[PDB]
Amino acid sequence: VEDHQSTPVHIKLQPPVTIESFVRRGEPFESTYTAVPERVVAMWQNSIETIIALGEGDRIVAGMGIPDRKYVRPEYREAYDKIPYKDLKYANLESVLMMKPDLLVGWKSTFTNKMLQTPTFWQARLANVYIAESSLGAQSALTMDMEYKYIRDLGRIFNRNMEAERLIQEMQQSVAYTVAQTAHEKPPKALFIEVQGKHFRLYGHKTLAGNIGASLHADVIDTETPSISMEDVVEQNPDVIFLIVSDGEYSQADVIMNYVLTQSGLQGVNALRNKRVHFLPLLAVYSPGIRLLDSIDIVSHGLYPNLYPEGVPDLI
Numbered sequence: 001v002e003d004h005q006s007t008p009v010h011i012k013l014q015p016p017v018t019i020e021s022f023v024r025r026g027e028p029f030e031s032t033y034t035a036v037p038e039r040v041v042a043m044w045q046n047s048i049e050t051i052i053a054l055g056e057g058d059r060i061v062a063g064m065g066i067p068d069r070k071y072v073r074p075e076y077r078e079a080y081d082k083i084p085y086k087d088l089k090y091a092n093l094e095s096v097l098m099m100k101p102d103l104l105v106g107w108k109s110t111f112t113n114k115m116l117q118t119p120t121f122w123q124a125r126l127a128n129v130y131i132a133e134s135s136l137g138a139q140s141a142l143t144m145d146m147e148y149k150y151i152r153d154l155g156r157i158f159n160r161n162m163e164a165e166r167l168i169q170e171m172q173q174s175v176a177y178t179v180a181q182t183a184h185e186k187p188p189k190a191l192f193i194e195v196q197g198k199h200f201r202l203y204g205h206k207t208l209a210g211n212i213g214a215s216l217h218a219d220v221i222d223t224e225t226p227s228i229s230m231e232d233v234v235e236q237n238p239d240v241i242f243l244i245v246s247d248g249e250y251s252q253a254d255v256i257m258n259y260v261l262t263q264s265g266l267q268g269v270n271a272l273r274n275k276r277v278h279f280l281p282l283l284a285v286y287s288p289g290i291r292l293l294d295s296i297d298i299v300s301h302g303l304y305p306n307l308y309p310e311g312v313p314d315l316i
Contacts, residue, residue: 002084008059011036017156021119021129024108025136029119030211031128036159041096043106043116045071046132046289048083050151051105052076053167053290054160057083059294061099064091069245070316071283073291093117102127103157107135107256107287134287141206144215147292148172171293179217181307188303189219191271192240192280193228194245195256202228203244209285212292212299230265239268240276240302247283250316278302278312 017033033103041062043046048063049072063086066072072080083100096104104127110116111129118131134146148168155164190213192203204222213220220230221236223257228236233250242245243260245253257277266272284295294315301308 002061006058008036008038010038011159011160019130019153021131021153022108022133022136023111023119023131025140031123031130033128033157037101037103037128037157039100039102040066041099041101041104042117043091043104043110044287045104045283045291046150046287048080049073049076049291050154050289051158052079054151054155054158054163055091056158056160059158061085061101062090062096064088071247073294080126091116103130104128105130105132105154107132108137108292128157130154130255132287132289138206140288142208142213143211144171144175144208144292147208147287147289150289167290167293171296173195174300175215178307180219182304185215187219188239189221189237190240190242190299190303191221191228191233191236192242192244192285194282195259197297200228200230200233201244202226203285208288209242209244209295209299211278212285212295213303214299216296216303218299218303230263234265234269237286238271239274240278241269241271242278242280242299242302244280244282244285247281253279253316276302276305279315281315284315 001012004210012035013033019031022028042051042060044065048066051057051060063083065088068082069077086273093116104116104122108131111118112129122129122303130300132150136143140205151168155161194201200204202225204224210220221238224231243256260277271277278298280295280298284291288295297313301312
């Protein structure tokens with residue numbers, strides 16, 4: 001399965017890197033790294049693609065949870081393909097023990113006795129654990145800031161600080177550019193929803209998608225309900241609708257879009273009249289790590305079509 005004839009170069013971290021992460025909201029733990037990890041088990045898209053984006057894809061032994069290479073950014077696909085273990089049937093404690101990771105990167109739910117075990121467990125095996133802060137739960141507002149720190153932390157762990165800062169700066173400069181070029185204009189009114197059956201799952205101010213809208217100076221709609229009625233959508237009347245789509249539901253994309261467009265109550269809504277309804281991949285707006293760049297582009301391009309005449313990017 002692995003290529004055992006090629007092993008990552010030993011890179012010492014002097015001085016040692018101390019990182020703060022959390023097992024739960026408000027429950028921090030500290031980890032100290034004296035060397036760049038050589039054998040990483042990475043759970044879910046943000047873990048996998050962020051480490052790849054930093055240039056350290058070769059250090060990943062397992063990168064599990066992406067359904068297919070097509071979901072990975074084109075420029076990261078080659079590195080993705082080299083990862084020895086990808087199949088979720090390896091995402092169990094017994095298989096991960098066999099792999100002998102020295103760093104495990106995942107979500108809050110990844111590191112309990114129901115799954116891959118706690119930081120305390122792994123620290124006794126001389127490994128470290130890093131947990132995405134944006135995976136700690138919906139009770140706290142999820143922000144772009146959490147994603148930046150996430151990228152920055154991984155940058156410190158892998159001695160890729162320069163690469164991390166460049167990536168972060170690209171995103172920050174992009175947001176700030178957009179807001180500055182349009183400050184004299186009326187802020188667009190945006191709606192972020194995911195379609196689940198015949199219902200509109202709402203993403204409001206406490207979600208990252210909401211925060212991306214707010215960061216970009218949009219007027220983000222939020223009725224503070226797990227769902228928004230077609231009736232409330234008519235009243236709120238967004239200039240632009242973002243349709244959030246999860247990964248398994250890519251195959252239903254055209255059916256989703258057609259359900260939203262070819263409606264009755266919705267036909268009067270500005271976003272529909274002016275054909276401003278765009279797909280927004282969940283993987284870019286829910287603990288996305290490096291893929292936050294994709295959502296910034298889609299949202300800024302959809303919010304401000306006059307600033308970005310080239311159009312809103314498509315993802316499958």
